């Protein structure tokens, strides 16, 4: 009633010590926070074995079959025939 | 009236004070502050026009069962 | 309740002046006086009995005593800058909610908006041209006066209007769109033809 | 009165305090990999470096505007102009054999006059 | 204050004049509510409801370009699932029973009441080009307007 | 109402910041006039003018 | 408060028994210095932009659980649960599709992020002090 | 900068979705991103690691290409 | 190892199409359209039961308790109400 | 152009290298002092042409 | 106090407040079997059992969280018959709902039960959080017995008792004391009880027009500063 | 209060008129710097800070 | 049914202005102008206007001299 807190008539221990509303509800987020350790470790556990498939498709996607080169040389294009002639005669 | 004032002083003509004490705060309070939600004692306001119903025995019974007179009214009812 | 007052002045602040606590020096009303409205006259007339009250209507006294100015609005302008730092969008909410309660049409509403936000858009635009000019005055040519309105015998061009017509035939210039020619990816063939030479 | 020293501190390396306005100022060391990522390139060489003196014919460098002139390459595709929005749906993808040379038009180009640019707003 | 905020009273009674309306037995309220929104910004450029996305792109109209895509595309599909709705009948729900014994005769009346089943939605979007046309006449004459 | 000549200063102070930063003002007005006529001219009856006309 | 206000305190707690018990108090202005720059519960020390990102996350995620309970297209095409004619299924998936997009929305914001930048125009503007250039830079 | 940002938006999801944990496992409504959320996630990780991965295989290339070719023109 | 994570590349999608870097762009205003559309609508049924919950009632009809109204009453009673009962009770079922 | 929002005067140290030999903590230390001197003249003029 | 004005209120172009069957172009119309080639519709006759089953699962489903509360589990079956008697008492005649009151609220039921397997529903979760705040008062007051000490419950029956004797004692004159005496007389014992405690304002205004929350304090100015804690 | 719109359109219309009409605005804006902030600092306290400070 | 007694109501404002400006200005700021502020505001008004005018007069004639 009276022994409630006042931020003027208050004490170095009992601010240390507090633990309001606002610790409260803290405390509903690092529960959930402690709870999603499986899920998100799940995530990077795959994102740690997804890195060695991608690793050995950079260099598939790099180097190709025999080290000659992959898809990573090839160019594609929307252009026809008229419309590539007419940039080389616009250069 | 359409014409009260300029724009800087519209805020001006909207309190209302119940006492005479000069000068006069001119703001006046839009909405009452609930800073914590804190879970009410009072009872709910939907409790206010509901015809009588089953609800009504069965809180009697629980209250009547709390002294002696009441659990024999019950049981023999 | 228990978390109430430490909560409650975690969220708002309270005046610190002690102005008031001066007797003689409280101000009746006369610094700073509303002009335009309808209870002007009543206004003027309490000030005028406050200023009686405090001499039993012997008003000479008040014109020999010392006259003092309202020390209760010192420092305001400063206290709602930093209150709009604090929370610009709580502070901008509550100084708008009045005026907010009379919404005007999704028409005028998206005037606004896409008036003030076509005028950043040019707005953004003259930046970039002013930086156009900056290289073009490093590049060697001096420049007299400023800005894209030829004066002179030279084409204008004003900037996109902002209506659907325009918008339809043209589109801004994407600078990410500009890209390296992909041919430079073939130059790695020189590094897959060492390797195998070196064997590697 | 904090926070206004602290801003203090970082507002000697950022100068405008406004967004938007201006860029921060750092000094920073001299060492042989300053720019070395685009050392390649020649246009940044000459705005960093050098600062021509303007003459009495009031014009930039014929060389410089003629190198100026080379169009540069710019991506066909577009999402912006509806007409492309919807023909490049139907548009077949097919390879661009390499012919030798690292100027292959294999693209629209960055060119207010080009057939397939002129949408485009160049300003 | 859902009361005295002009801003929520224009929302709310505005959203329960539109969700009222599927009495009206279009189809299920929940499924097309959401091309109801795509189809709000491209006929809602004549309002300039497209501004508050001006600076999300390079195009003021991006979302209004898309949105005109998405509402023929599904809006074709419409007939196409009502058909596979009807099962294999689906002939009989449109033009009713054959008059002839020859199938190959009423293949081709039948296809002609599979064409006008989409007929009757294809045709609906010459009305479109219509207020393009004379919105764009006007933009022309307004942007051409004299000014000395 | 307390600071009208104190928010005056500050008001042009800022528009003078503009005018002085913003050196193609000009340019920004003239691409303005398109626009502002158009708008206004489409969307007055369905603001102001169904006040005194049609519906 | 919070726990990094708590750390403050306990590295603090000498120096607010010299702030607020002698210089608090002592006289004249070392009283109203020390009564300035008192140590303890903060005065207005919310953090508005904790609290813009509690409201924002509780109504986006209010939108996120309208645009992922939908009526499954594939359930729909059997007309033995709950669906025999709906002329709009293929909409089912459509704001789910959307919603799952919008978690790139932060991992690609702006042009850099959606490319290498180094092949792009804009990066030799970067490295030549956001200074204009032509732009055929990249080819010269 | 560009795989830093990339990868703390990725890790910023991953805190949206600590966050809010009870509502994506326990509330039904939002099971679609309960059960996608981590196939967007790797495919992200995938992307970020990938240009990455690249990046570096072309830089490496490029270094041992100038030492060997240098010396051949000693 | 297959190609199919060749999708994962952004450094050379200008090679093949270069349209992920534009779609998506849509893709996110479009999320945030629909949130502001869909949120409005699903969260301003609150003043309709707000409303008629409190003044749709009328004197001519029963009006019959709810789920929450049955809790409330059974399970969510104060003291006072549990003094009133009882003090009722005691005065005229047993002391008349 | 520190002060300016958007500023276009690109040419007016806007691309320079601009350091001092002044007091560092510039809007605390140094910004302040003209001010401060500002109101002495102001004040000292006031009383003198009063 | 106030009245709706406009008679046409309840007024629609299907009758007067008629919300079973709204007017709309596609009206129902009947079928012809001679004539009917074939037909594809989701009507059917398993609405009644469906509706029994779905009252048998809800509430065994959740009565798997009550713990054994007998007392719990009446409470709950009274407040789901309330539920499900929605269409036998409503105003709405559905029975004459557009296609098939049946259908529609089964339907409507089972995804509340869907809710329910998953122990989601928000009437759950309100039951729970409404009976653990009831069992906590019980068990302060069952506590305090033990210990031989008085509620503050019992102190305010014994306090009304004796005040009851008090007016009823000098009440001779007449000696009808009815219900309304006894219910101010424990009013004023509530209200004086209830200002006793030390509860946030509830009302607006106190006795002075004035807001009785944190932020009515206006001038004059008379706080100093701050102070900090105390060592 | 009737014709808010349309007299928005006209005012801006006015304001485009001269800002379309007066191609150096950038020059009159720097020119109006200094004697804004020179009458505002020296006649504030006249108007404004006198009901404040000092007197 | 409108307001059509509101009608033509810019254009029959905009002809009183015509016939005598000075008379409709007059009236139509009575209200305003009974709250009249100091020497020194009314004089800032007139002074930073005539100052803006005769800037926008130098800057016509800046523009013949950029014409010649
Ligand atoms: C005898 C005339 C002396 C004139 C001296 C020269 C000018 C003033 C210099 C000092 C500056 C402070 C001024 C304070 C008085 C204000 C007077 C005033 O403004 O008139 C208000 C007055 C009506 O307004 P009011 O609100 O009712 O007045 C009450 C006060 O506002 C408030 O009411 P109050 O009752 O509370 O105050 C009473 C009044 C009583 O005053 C007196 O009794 C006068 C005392 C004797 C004279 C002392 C000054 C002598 C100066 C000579 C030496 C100058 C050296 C300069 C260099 C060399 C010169 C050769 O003021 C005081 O009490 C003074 C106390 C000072 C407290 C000091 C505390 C410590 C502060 C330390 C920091 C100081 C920083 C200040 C910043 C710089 C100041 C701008 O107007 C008239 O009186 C009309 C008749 C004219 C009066 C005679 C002329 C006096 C000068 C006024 C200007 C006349 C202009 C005429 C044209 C009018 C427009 C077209
Ligand atoms: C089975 C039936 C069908 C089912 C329908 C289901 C409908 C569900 C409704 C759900 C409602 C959603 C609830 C949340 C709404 C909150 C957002 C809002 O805008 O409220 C404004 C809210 C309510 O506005 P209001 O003042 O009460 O006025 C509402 C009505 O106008 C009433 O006032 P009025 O009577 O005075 O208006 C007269 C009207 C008079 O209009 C007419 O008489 C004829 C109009 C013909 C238009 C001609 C179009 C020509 C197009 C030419 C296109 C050329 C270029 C195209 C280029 C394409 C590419 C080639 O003229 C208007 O002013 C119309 C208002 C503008 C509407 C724009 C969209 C029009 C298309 C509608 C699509 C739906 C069609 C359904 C089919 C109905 C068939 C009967 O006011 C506010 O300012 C507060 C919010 C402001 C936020 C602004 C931000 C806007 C953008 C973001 C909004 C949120 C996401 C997007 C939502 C979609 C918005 C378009
Ligand atoms: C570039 C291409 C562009 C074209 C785009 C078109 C895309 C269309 C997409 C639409 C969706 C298609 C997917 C179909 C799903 C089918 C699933 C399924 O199998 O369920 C069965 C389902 C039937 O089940 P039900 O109707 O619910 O109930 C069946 C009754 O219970 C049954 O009662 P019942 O037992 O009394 O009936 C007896 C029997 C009677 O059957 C007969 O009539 C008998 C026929 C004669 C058989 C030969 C007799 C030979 C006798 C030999 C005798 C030998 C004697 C030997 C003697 C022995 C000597 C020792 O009936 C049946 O059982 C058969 C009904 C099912 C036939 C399904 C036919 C599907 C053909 C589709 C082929 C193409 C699919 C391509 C998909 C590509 C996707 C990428 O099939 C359907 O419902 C068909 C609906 C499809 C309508 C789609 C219409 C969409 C519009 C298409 C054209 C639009 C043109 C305009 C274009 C405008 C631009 C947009
Ligand atoms: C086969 C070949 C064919 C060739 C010919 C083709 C021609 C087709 C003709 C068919 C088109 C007409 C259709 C009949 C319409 C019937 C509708 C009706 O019942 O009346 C509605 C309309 C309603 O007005 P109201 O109800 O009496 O009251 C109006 C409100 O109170 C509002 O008044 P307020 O006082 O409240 O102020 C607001 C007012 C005024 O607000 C303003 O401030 C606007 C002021 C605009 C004029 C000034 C512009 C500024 C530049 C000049 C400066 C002047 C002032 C300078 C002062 C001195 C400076 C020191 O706002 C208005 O704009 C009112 C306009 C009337 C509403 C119509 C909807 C307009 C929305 C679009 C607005 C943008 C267009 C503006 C057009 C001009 C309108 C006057 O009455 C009409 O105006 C009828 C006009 C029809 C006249 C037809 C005469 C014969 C036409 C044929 C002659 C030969 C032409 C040859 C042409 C050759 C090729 C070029
Ligand atoms: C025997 C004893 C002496 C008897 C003298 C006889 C007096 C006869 C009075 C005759 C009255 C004439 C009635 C007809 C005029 C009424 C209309 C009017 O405009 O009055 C203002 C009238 C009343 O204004 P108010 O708001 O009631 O304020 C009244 C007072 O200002 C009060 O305002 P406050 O209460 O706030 O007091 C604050 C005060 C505070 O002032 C102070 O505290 C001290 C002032 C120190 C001044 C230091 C000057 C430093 C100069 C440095 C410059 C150096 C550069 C030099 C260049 C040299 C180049 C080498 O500051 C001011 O008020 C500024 C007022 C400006 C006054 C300008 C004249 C100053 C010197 C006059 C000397 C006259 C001899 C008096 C000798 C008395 C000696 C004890 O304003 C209006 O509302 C009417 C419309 C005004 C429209 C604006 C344009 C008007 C201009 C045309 C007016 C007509 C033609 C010219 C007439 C003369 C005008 C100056
Ligand atoms: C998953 O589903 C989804 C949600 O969940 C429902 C959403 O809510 C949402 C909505 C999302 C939001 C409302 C969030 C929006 C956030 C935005 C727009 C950006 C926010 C930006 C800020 C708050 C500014 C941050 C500024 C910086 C980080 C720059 C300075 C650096 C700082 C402050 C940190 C220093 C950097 C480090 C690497 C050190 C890190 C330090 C720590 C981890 C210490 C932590 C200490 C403690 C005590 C925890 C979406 C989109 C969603 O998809
Ligand atoms: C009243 C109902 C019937 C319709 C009539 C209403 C329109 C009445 C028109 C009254 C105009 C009277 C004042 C016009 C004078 C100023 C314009 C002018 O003089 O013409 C300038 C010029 C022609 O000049 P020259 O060909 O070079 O001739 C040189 C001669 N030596 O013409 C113009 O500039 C066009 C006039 C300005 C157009 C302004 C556009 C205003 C937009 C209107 C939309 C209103 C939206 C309302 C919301």
Redesign the pocket.
């Given at each position: 009633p009276q022994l409630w807190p006042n931020p003027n008539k208050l004490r170095f221990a009992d601010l240390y010590k507090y633990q309001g509303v606002e610790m409260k509800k803290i405390n509903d987020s690092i529960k959930n926070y402690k709870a999603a350790k499986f899920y998100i470790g799940g995530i990077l556990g795959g994102c740690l074995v997804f890195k060695f498939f991608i690793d050995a498709a950079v260099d598939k996607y790099i180097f190709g079959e025999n080290g000659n080169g992959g898809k990573f040389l090839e160019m594609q294009t929307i252009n026809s025939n008229y419309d590539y002639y007419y940039n080389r005669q616009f250069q | 009236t359409l014409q009260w004032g300029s724009l800087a002083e519209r805020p001006m003509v909207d309190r209302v004070m119940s006492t005479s004490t000069w000068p006069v705060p001119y703001y006046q309070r839009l909405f009452k502050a609930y800073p914590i939600r804190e879970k009410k004692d009072k009872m709910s306001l939907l409790l206010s026009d509901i015809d009588i119903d089953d609800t009504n025995w069965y809180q009697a019974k629980d209250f009547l069962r709390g002294s002696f007179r009441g659990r024999q009214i019950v049981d023999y009812v | 309740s228990l978390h109430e007052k430490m909560q409650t002045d975690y969220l708002w602040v309270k005046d610190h002046s002690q102005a008031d606590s001066w007797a003689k020096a409280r101000t009746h009303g006369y610094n700073y006086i509303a002009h335009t409205v309808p209870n002007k006259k009543e206004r003027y007339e309490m000030i005028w009995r406050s200023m009686g009250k405090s001499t039993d209507w012997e008003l000479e006294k008040f014109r020999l005593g010392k006259k003092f100015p309202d020390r209760g609005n010192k420092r305001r302008w400063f206290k709602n800058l930093f209150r709009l730092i604090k929370n610009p969008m709580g502070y901008i909410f509550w100084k708008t909610y009045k005026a907010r309660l009379a919404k005007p049409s999704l028409i005028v509403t998206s005037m606004f908006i896409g008036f003030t936000l076509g005028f950043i858009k040019l707005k953004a635009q003259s930046i970039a041209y002013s930086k156009k000019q900056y290289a073009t005055l490093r590049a060697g040519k001096n420049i007299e006066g400023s800005g894209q309105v030829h004066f002179g015998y030279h084409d204008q061009k004003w900037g996109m209007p902002a209506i659907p017509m325009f918008q339809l035939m043209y589109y801004e210039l994407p600078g990410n769109s500009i890209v390296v020619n992909p041919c430079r990816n073939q130059n790695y063939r020189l590094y897959f033809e060492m390797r195998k030479k070196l064997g590697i | 009165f904090v926070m206004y020293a602290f801003a203090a501190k970082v507002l000697d390396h950022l100068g405008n305090p406004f967004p938007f306005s201006g860029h921060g100022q750092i000094v920073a060391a001299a060492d042989r990999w300053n720019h070395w990522d685009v050392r390649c390139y020649d246009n940044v060489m000459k705005a960093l470096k050098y600062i021509r003196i303007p003459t009495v014919q009031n014009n930039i460098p014929e060389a410089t505007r003629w190198y100026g002139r080379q169009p540069g390459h710019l991506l066909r595709a577009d999402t912006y102009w509806i007409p492309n929005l919807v023909s490049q749906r139907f548009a077949k993808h097919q390879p661009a054999h390499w012919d030798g040379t690292q100027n292959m038009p294999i693209f629209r180009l960055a060119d207010p006059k080009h057939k397939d640019s002129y949408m485009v707003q160049f300003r | 204050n859902p009361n005295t905020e002009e801003n929520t009273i224009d929302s709310d009674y505005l959203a329960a004049s539109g969700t009222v309306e599927a009495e009206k037995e279009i189809t299920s309220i929940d499924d097309y509510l959401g091309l109801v929104f795509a189809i709000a910004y491209v006929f809602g450029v004549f309002f300039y409801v497209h501004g508050w996305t001006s600076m999300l792109s390079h195009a003021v109209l991006l979302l209004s370009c898309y949105s005109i895509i998405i509402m023929f595309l599904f809006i074709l599909g419409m007939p196409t699932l009502l058909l596979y709705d009807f099962g294999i009948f689906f002939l009989a729900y449109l033009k009713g029973a054959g008059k002839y014994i020859s199938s190959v005769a009423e293949m081709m009346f039948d296809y002609t009441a599979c064409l006008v089943f989409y007929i009757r939605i294809l045709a609906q979007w010459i009305r479109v080009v219509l207020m393009v046309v004379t919105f764009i006449s006007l933009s022309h004459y307004v942007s051409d307007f004299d000014i000395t | 109402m307390s600071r009208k000549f104190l928010l005056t200063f500050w008001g042009g102070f800022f528009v003078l910041n503009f005018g002085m930063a913003t050196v193609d003002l000009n340019w920004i007005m003239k691409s303005t006039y398109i626009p502002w006529i158009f708008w206004?001219?489409?969307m007055?009856?369905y603001v102001?003018?169904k006040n005194?006309?049609?519906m | 408060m919070n726990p990094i206000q708590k750390a403050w305190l306990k590295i603090l707690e000498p120096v607010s028994y010299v702030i607020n018990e002698k210089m608090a108090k002592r006289t004249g202005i070392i009283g109203k210095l020390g009564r300035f720059f008192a140590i303890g519960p903060r005065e207005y020390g919310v953090h508005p932009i904790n609290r813009m990102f509690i409201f924002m996350n509780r109504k986006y995620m209010a939108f996120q659980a309208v645009a992922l309970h939908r009526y499954s297209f594939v359930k729909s095409l059997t007309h033995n649960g709950f669906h025999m004619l709906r002329v709009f299924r293929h909409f089912a998936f459509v704001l789910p599709a959307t919603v799952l997009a919008g978690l790139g929305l932060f991992v690609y914001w702006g042009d850099d992020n959606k490319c290498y930048s180094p092949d792009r125009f804009p990066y030799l503007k970067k490295r030549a002090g956001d200074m204009a250039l032509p732009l055929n830079s990249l080819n010269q | 900068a560009t795989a830093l940002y990339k990868s703390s938006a990725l890790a910023g999801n991953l805190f949206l979705y600590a966050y809010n944990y009870n509502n994506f496992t326990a509330n039904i409504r939002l099971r679609t991103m309960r059960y996608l959320f981590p196939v967007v996630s790797l495919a992200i990780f995938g992307n970020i690691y990938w240009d990455y991965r690249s990046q570096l295989v072309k830089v490496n290339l490029f270094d041992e290409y100038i030492q060997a070719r240098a010396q051949e023109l000693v | 190892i297959l190609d199919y994570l060749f999708l994962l590349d952004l450094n050379d999608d200008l090679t093949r199409k270069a349209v992920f870097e534009q779609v998506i762009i849509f893709i996110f205003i479009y999320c945030t359209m629909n949130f502001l559309a869909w949120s409005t609508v699903v969260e301003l049924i609150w003043p309709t039961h707000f409303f008629n919950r409190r003044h749709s009632s009328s004197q001519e009809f029963i009006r019959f308790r709810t789920y929450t109204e049955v809790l409330l009453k059974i399970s969510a009673y104060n003291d006072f109400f549990y003094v009133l009962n009882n003090y009722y009770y005691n005065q005229k079922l047993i002391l008349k | 152009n520190s002060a300016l929002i958007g500023s276009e005067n690109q040419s007016d140290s806007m691309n320079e290298l601009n350091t001092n030999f002044s007091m560092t903590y510039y809007i605390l230390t140094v910004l302040p002092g003209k001010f401060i001197y500002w109101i002495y003249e102001i004040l000292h003029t006031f009383f003198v042409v009063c | 106090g106030y009245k709706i004005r406009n008679k046409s209120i309840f007024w629609t172009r299907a009758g007067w407040k008629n919300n079973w069957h709204p007017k709309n172009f596609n009206a129902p119309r009947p079928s012809y079997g001679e004539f009917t080639m074939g037909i594809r519709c989701r009507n059917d006759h398993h609405s009644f059992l469906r509706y029994v089953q779905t009252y048998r699962n809800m509430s065994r489903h959740c009565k798997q969280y009550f713990l054994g509360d007998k007392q719990l589990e009446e409470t709950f079956i009274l407040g789901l018959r309330s539920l499900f008697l929605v269409p036998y008492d409503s105003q709405c005649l559905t029975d004459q709902i557009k296609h098939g009151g049946e259908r529609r609220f089964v339907d409507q039921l089972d995804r509340d039960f869907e809710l329910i397997s998953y122990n989601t529903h928000p009437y759950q979760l309100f039951t729970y959080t409404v009976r653990n705040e009831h069992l906590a008062w019980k068990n302060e007051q069952y506590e305090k017995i033990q210990k031989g000490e008085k509620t503050f419950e019992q102190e305010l029956l014994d306090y009304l008792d004796e005040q009851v004797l008090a007016e009823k004692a000098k009440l001779r004159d007449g000696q009808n004391f009815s219900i309304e005496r006894m219910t101010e007389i424990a009013l004023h014992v509530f209200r004086k009880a209830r200002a006793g405690k030390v509860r946030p304002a509830q009302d607006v205004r106190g006795p002075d027009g004035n807001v009785n929350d944190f932020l009515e304090q206006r001038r004059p100015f008379e706080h100093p500063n701050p102070t900090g804690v105390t060592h």
């Open positions: - | - | - | - | - | 206004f001219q489409l007055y009856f102001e003018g005194s006309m049609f | - | - | - | - | -």
